C-alpha cells in the first residue's frame, strides 16, 4: 500500500530507460557494435525483469501472501532467477568482449554465439524450478529450498562474478611519440644505409627507444637484426628492418585501438561496480542466514531485494553520463 505505488514508479522508470537504450542502439549506426549488442541484450534482460517478474514481487510486498497457484509461483520464480542469471552472465560476456577488443583488436558469429550461450546457460540453471522442485508452502512464494539457494548462489553469482573480476583484472593489467619518431628515422637510416656500422648504430638507437614502448617482440626482433650487423650482413639486416617497420606500425595501430576502447571499458567497469554494489547485501545476508543461523528479519531481505532491483534502472543513466553517442541518440530520439 505504501511501497506499492513507489515501486510501481520504479518499474515504469526501468521499462522506459531500457526501451530507450534499445531504440537508441537500434536506429543509430554509430552505436552498432558488438559490445553494444551485448549491452542491448542486457537491457532486454532488465526489461524482462521489470515487466514479467517485478509486478508479482510488488504484489507480495503489498499483500504478504501469495494467493495464486503453486505453478504460477514456480514459473515466475523461474523467470526471476533466469533473468538475473542472464544479467550477470551478460556482464561476464561484456567483460570478455572488452578483453578481446583491447588485447586482440584484430565477426558477428562470436557475438551471436555468446548471446545464445548466455541465455541457454541461464535457462539451464533455472530449469529445475518449473519442474516442481520448488516446494513452496501454501500462500507463500519463495525459493523454498536452501540447497537450491546454495547452488544458485554458486553457479549464478559467485562463478560469473569471480570470472568477470579476473577478466577485468587482466584488462587493468593492460596499461611515446618521440619514440616512434626515433624508430622511423632510424628505419629510414637503415633503408638508405650501405654499410654495417650505420645499421648497427641505428638498431642500437632503435632498441634504446623501443624499451619505453614494450614490456617484448619488437625488442627481440631488434636483437636478431643486431646480431646480423656484427657479422656484416647488411641486406639481411635491411630485410629484418623492413619487417621491424611492420611490427612498429602494428604497435601504433594496437595502442590506438586501445585508446579508443578504454572509455567504453571504463563505463562498463563502473556499470559492473554498481551492479555488484546493488546485489552484494542480498547474498551477504543469504550467507549469513545459511552459515550463521542468524535470525534475519524479512525487512532486510525485502530491502536488499529492492536494493538489487534498483540496479535495473541505473544502467541507462551510466550510458547517458559516460558515453557521447549514447547521449546524442537519446536527445535525438526524444525529439
Amino acid at each position, epitope marked *: 500500500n505504501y511501497y506499492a505505488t513507489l515501486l510501481t514508479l520504479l518499474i515504469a522508470v526501468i521499462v522506459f530507460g531500457n526501451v530507450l537504450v534499445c531504440m537508441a542502439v537500434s536506429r543509430e549506426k554509430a552505436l552498432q557494435t558488438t559490445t553494444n549488442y551485448l549491452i542491448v541484450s542486457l537491457a532486454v534482460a532488465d526489461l524482462l525483469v521489470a515487466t514479467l517478474v517485478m509486478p508479482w514481487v510488488v504484489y507480495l510486498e503489498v499483500v504478504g501472501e501469495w494467493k495464486f497457484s503453486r505453478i504460477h509461483c514456480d514459473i515466475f520464480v523461474t523467470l526471476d532467477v533466469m533473468m538475473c542469471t542472464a544479467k550477470i552472465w551478460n556482464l561476464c560476456a561484456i567483460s570478455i568482449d572488452r578483453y578481446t577488443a583491447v588485447a586482440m583488436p584484430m565477426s558477428k558469429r562470436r557475438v551471436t554465439v555468446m548471446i545464445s550461450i548466455v541465455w541457454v546457460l541461464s535457462f539451464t540453471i533455472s530449469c529445475p524450478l518449473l519442474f516442481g522442485l520448488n*516446494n513452496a508452502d*501454501q500462500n507463500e512464494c*519463495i525459493i*523454498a529450498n*536452501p540447497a537450491f539457494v546454495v547452488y544458485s548462489s554458486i553457479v549464478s553469482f559467485y562463478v560469473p562474478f569471480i570470472v568477470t573480476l579476473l577478466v577485468y583484472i587482466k584488462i587493468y593489467i593492460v596499461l611515446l611519440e618521440d619514440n616512434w619518431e626515433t624508430l622511423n628515422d632510424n628505419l629510414k637510416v637503415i633503408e638508405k644505409a650501405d654499410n654495417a656500422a650505420q645499421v648497427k648504430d641505428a638498431l642500437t638507437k632503435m632498441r634504446a627507444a623501443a624499451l619505453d614502448a614494450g614490456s617484448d617482440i619488437l625488442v627481440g626482433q631488434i636483437d636478431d637484426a643486431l646480431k646480423l650487423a656484427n657479422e656484416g650482413k647488411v641486406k639481411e639486416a635491411q630485410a629484418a628492418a623492413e619487417q621491424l617497420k611492420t611490427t612498429i606500425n602494428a604497435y601504433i595501430q594496437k595502442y590506438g585501438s586501445q585508446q579508443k576502447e578504454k572509455k567504453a571499458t571504463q563505463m562498463l567497469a563502473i556499470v559492473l561496480g554498481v551492479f555488484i554494489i546493488c546485489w552484494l547485501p542480498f547474498f551477504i545476508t543469504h550467507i549469513l542466514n545459511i552459515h550463521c543461523d542468524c*535470525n*534475519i528479519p524479512p525487512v532486510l531481505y525485502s530491502a536488499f531485494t529492492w536494493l538489487g532491483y534498483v540496479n535495473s534502472a541505473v544502467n541507462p543513466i551510466i550510458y547517458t553520463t559516460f558515453n557521447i553517442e549514447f547521449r546524442k541518440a537519446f536527445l535525438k530520439i526524444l525529439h
Partner: antibody
Framework: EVQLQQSGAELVKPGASVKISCKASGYSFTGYNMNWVKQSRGKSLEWIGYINPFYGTTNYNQRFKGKATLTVDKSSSTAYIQLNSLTSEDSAVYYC?????????????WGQGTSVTVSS | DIVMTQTTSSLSASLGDRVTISCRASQDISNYLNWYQQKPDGTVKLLLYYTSRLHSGVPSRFSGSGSGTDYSLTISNLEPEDIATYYCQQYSKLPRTFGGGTKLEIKR
C-alpha cells in the same frame, strides 16, 4: 529420529503474555515450516498459523493476528509462540507441528502439547 | 473459512468391526482433506493425506474416500489401539480448518 518437545504447562494471570517453546530434533530445522495449532477445552482444533524457519516469514490465520507471534531460533533450532493479552478464551492446549513436505497442507509430526490456563 | 462438520461426536463400535467416520465440508474442497488421530494421552498422529494416501507407518486397516463435500475414513477391523479421536482437516483454502472430532468407544 524426529522429536518435537514443547515447554511445560503455563498458569498465567489474565491480561499478561506467555511464550511457549517447541524444540525439534532429527532433521534439518530450517527446511520444514513449523505450524502452531490450538485445541480448546471443547476438543476442537484451530490452525493458529505457520512460520518458515529459513526466511522467518509467517502466515497467520486472520483470527489469531495480533494474538499470536511466531518466532524461531535457528541456533537452538526451536520455534516459539507468544500469546499476548490473555483472556479466558485463550486457555487451551497448544501444539507445534511439522509441515509434511509430501502432503500439501498436512502436518506429519506433532508435539506433546502445552496447556495454558488463564485465571486470576 | 470452510467449516468442517463431523456428523457424530461419539461413536460406539464392537472390536474387530468396520468403522466409518463421515466428514462434511461446507463447500467443495475438491478432495483436499487429511485425517489425524489423537490418543487419550493427547498425542496426535497423521494418518491420511489427499483423502486416500496412507502416511508412513500406519496400518492398512485405514482407508479414506470421498468427493465434493462428503468424505469418510474407514477402519476395516477395529483393534484396541484404534480407540481414539479422529479429526478431519481441509486444506483447500486458507485458513486450514478442522472437524469437530469423532471419538471412538468400545461397544459392550
Amino acid at each position: 529420529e524426529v522429536q518435537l518437545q514443547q515447554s511445560g504447562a503455563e498458569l498465567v494471570k489474565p491480561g499478561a503474555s506467555v511464550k511457549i517453546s517447541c524444540k525439534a530434533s532429527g532433521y534439518s530445522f530450517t527446511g520444514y515450516n513449523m505450524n502452531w495449532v490450538k485445541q480448546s477445552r471443547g476438543k476442537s482444533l484451530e490452525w493458529i498459523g505457520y512460520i518458515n524457519p529459513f526466511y522467518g516469514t509467517t502466515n497467520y490465520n486472520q483470527r489469531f493476528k495480533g494474538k499470536a507471534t511466531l518466532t524461531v531460533d535457528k541456533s537452538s533450532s526451536t520455534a516459539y509462540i507468544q500469546l499476548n493479552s490473555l483472556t479466558s478464551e485463550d486457555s487451551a492446549v497448544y501444539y507445534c507441528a511439522r509441515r509434511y513436505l509430501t502432503g500439501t497442507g498436512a502436518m506429519d509430526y506433532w508435539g506433546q502439547g502445552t496447556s495454558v490456563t488463564v485465571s486470576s | 473459512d470452510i467449516v468442517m462438520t463431523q456428523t457424530t461426536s461419539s461413536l460406539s463400535a464392537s472390536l474387530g468391526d468396520r468403522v466409518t467416520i463421515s466428514c462434511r465440508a461446507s463447500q467443495d474442497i475438491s478432495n483436499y482433506l487429511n485425517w489425524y488421530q489423537q490418543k487419550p494421552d493427547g498425542t496426535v498422529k497423521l494418518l491420511l493425506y489427499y483423502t486416500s494416501r496412507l502416511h508412513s507407518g500406519v496400518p492398512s486397516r485405514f482407508s479414506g474416500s470421498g468427493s465434493g463435500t462428503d468424505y469418510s475414513l474407514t477402519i476395516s477391523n477395529l483393534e484396541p489401539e484404534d480407540i481414539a479421536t479422529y479429526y478431519c482437516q481441509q486444506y483447500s483454502k486458507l485458513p486450514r480448518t478442522f472437524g469437530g472430532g469423532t471419538k471412538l468407544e468400545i461397544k459392550r
